[PDB]
């Protein structure tokens, strides 16, 4: 129909330290299966 509130795009809220909390866990375990800050997270190429 229309807008009667405020122009505010949709957004998601994650905590700032949680993503580092899970990071150190997978990182430490990743050192076993894969060669051991050499870990790089990059966006997908696309398509």
């Amino acid at each position, epitope marked *: 129909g229309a807008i*009667i*509130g*405020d*122009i*505010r*795009k949709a*957004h998601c809220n994650i905590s700032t330290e949680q993503w580092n909390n899970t990071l150190t866990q997978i990182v430490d375990k990743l050192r076993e299966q894969f060669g051991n800050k050499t870990i790089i997270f990059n966006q997908s190429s696309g398509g």
Partner: antibody, heavy 132, light 105 residues
Framework: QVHLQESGPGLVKPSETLSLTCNVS????????WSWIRQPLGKQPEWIGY???????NYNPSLKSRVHLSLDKSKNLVSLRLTGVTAADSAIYYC??????????????????????????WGKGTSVTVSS | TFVSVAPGQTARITCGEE??????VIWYQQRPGQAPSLIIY??????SGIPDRFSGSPGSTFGTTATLTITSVEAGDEADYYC????????????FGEGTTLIVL
């Protein structure tokens, strides 16, 4: 105690590059923002806008044709100049300071805030009229 | 746009359009033959030099209209009142609204 003095010839010929001046009182122009207000005789005031050195030289969007604001740091003077005065320019003008104000209603990074200005003090002004 | 209120009574002033979005209303007054001044510098915040008698509506209203409530009108209240809306929807409006000239008997 804040007071200021203006100038003007009183009678201005049509189609003349009229110039107006406004001085300061104690406060320097570098650390302050100035605004001009035009009020027709007996009607609601009209806001020209605000001018400030180093980038903040926004003018009135409605006119954006002949308005020209300049500053003189050495003389501590601000000048207002119009080119091609018309018959509808007969109004009282006011040069005065303004104060900022912030409001946020959304995400800090998505530009949901607009600065609003309020004039704590107002100038004495000088009458300008056009005749033949 | 002329309002007649007897001394010592309550007064209501209506200014601005419908509340499509949030507002930050600024209230101004004009004295005949004297420079203007300020009363309220925000939606509800006020500067020094004036008591808490003045009141206003918050800017979190949708579909309503900005209003001003004045009580215990005195002899010094005779002045022209102007409103300045500040909406996030429309650009900054450089023309003030219909000034309400409040006269006291």
């Amino acid at each position: 105690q804040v007071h200021l003095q203006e100038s003007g010839p009183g009678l201005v010929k049509p189609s003349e590059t009229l110039s107006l001046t406004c001085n300061v009182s104690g406060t320097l122009v570098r650390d302050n923002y100035w605004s001009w207000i035009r009020q027709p005789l007996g009607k609601q005031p009209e806001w020209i806008g605000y001018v400030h050195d180093s980038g903040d030289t926004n003018y009135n969007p409605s006119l954006k044709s002949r308005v020209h604001l300049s500053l003189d740091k050495s003389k501590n003077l601000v000048s207002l100049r119009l080119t091609g005065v018309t018959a509808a320019d007969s109004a009282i003008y006011y040069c005065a300071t303004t104060k900022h104000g912030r409001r946020i209603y959304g995400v800090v990074a998505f530009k949901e805030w607009f600065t609003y200005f309020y004039m704590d003090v107002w100038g004495k002004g000088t009458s300008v009229t056009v005749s033949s | 746009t002329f309002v007649s209120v007897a001394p010592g009574q309550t007064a209501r002033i209506t200014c601005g359009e419908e509340s499509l979005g949030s507002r930050s209303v600024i209230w101004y007054q004009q004295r005949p033959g004297q420079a203007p001044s300020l009363i309220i510098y925000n939606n509800n915040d006020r500067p020094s030099g004036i008591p808490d008698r003045f009141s206003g509506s918050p800017g979190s209203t949708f579909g309503t209209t900005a209003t001003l409530t004045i009580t215990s009108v005195e002899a010094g209240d005779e002045a022209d009142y102007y409103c300045h809306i500040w909406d996030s929807r429309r650009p900054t409006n450089w023309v003030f609204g219909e000034g309400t000239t409040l006269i006291v008997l």
